[PDB]
Design a binder for this molecule. Structure first.
Ligand SMILES: O=C(Nc1ccc(C(=O)NCc2c(C(=O)O)[nH]c3ccccc23)cc1)NC1CC1
Length: 164
């Protein structure tokens, strides 16, 4: 099971870890991907998860978009977790670097409530441009199911814990 996580609330836990390595070790029921609306997994968490699947995540994602069209910002879809998890919940948080509305971050975290337990990154953080301290606050105030947050950067992890 999940190990070495610091407890933040009744249901939110956090660890300084690479979500790829965490997923390979735990093989959770659900791993969250920090997706974009086109499911083009180029960089950040999405690029790293896709690379770990040997591009199988991108092949499945392209078939999903060809059938269904793009997701909405704040929306999600459930696909295979391949070699990382039973399922991957692809969630689209707003990308501040593309000018998207930061109020959609709460809608993005609401997708997590459809799953009892998840391994996840902070949405809209990293290359999506939002303040990770804000993202953690919205996560704690929105998600009611059990969420295990993996924060790649050690210095950001320490700041997130110390300012919580
Ligand atoms: O390449 C990797 N891992 C690996 C590579 C990159 C990341 C990463 O961009 N993280 C930042 C991030 C966070 C976060 O950390 O809060 N949230 C986000 C939301 C959207 C986009 C990005 C982020 C994460 C993991 N592993 C290989 C070597 C075995």
């Amino acid at each position: 099971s999940f190990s070495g996580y610091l407890k933040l609330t009744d249901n939110v836990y956090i660890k300084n870890a690479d979500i790829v390595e965490e997923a390979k070790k735990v093989k959770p029921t659900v791993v969250v991907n920090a997706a974009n609306v086109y499911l083009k997994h180029g960089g950040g968490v999405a690029g790293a998860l896709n690379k770990a699947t040997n591009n199988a995540m991108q092949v499945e994602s392209d078939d999903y978009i060809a059938t269904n069209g793009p997701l909405k910002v704040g929306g999600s879809c459930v696909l295979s977790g391949h070699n990382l998890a039973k399922h991957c919940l692809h969630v689209v948080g707003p990308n501040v670097n593309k000018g998207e509305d930061i109020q959609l971050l709460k809608s993005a975290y609401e997708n997590f409530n459809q799953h009892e337990v998840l391994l996840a990154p902070l949405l809209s953080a990293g290359i999506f441009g939002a303040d990770p301290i804000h993202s953690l606050r919205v996560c704690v105030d929105t998600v009611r199911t059990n969420v295990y947050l993996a924060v790649f950067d050690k210095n950001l992890y320490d700041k997130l814990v110390s300012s919580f």
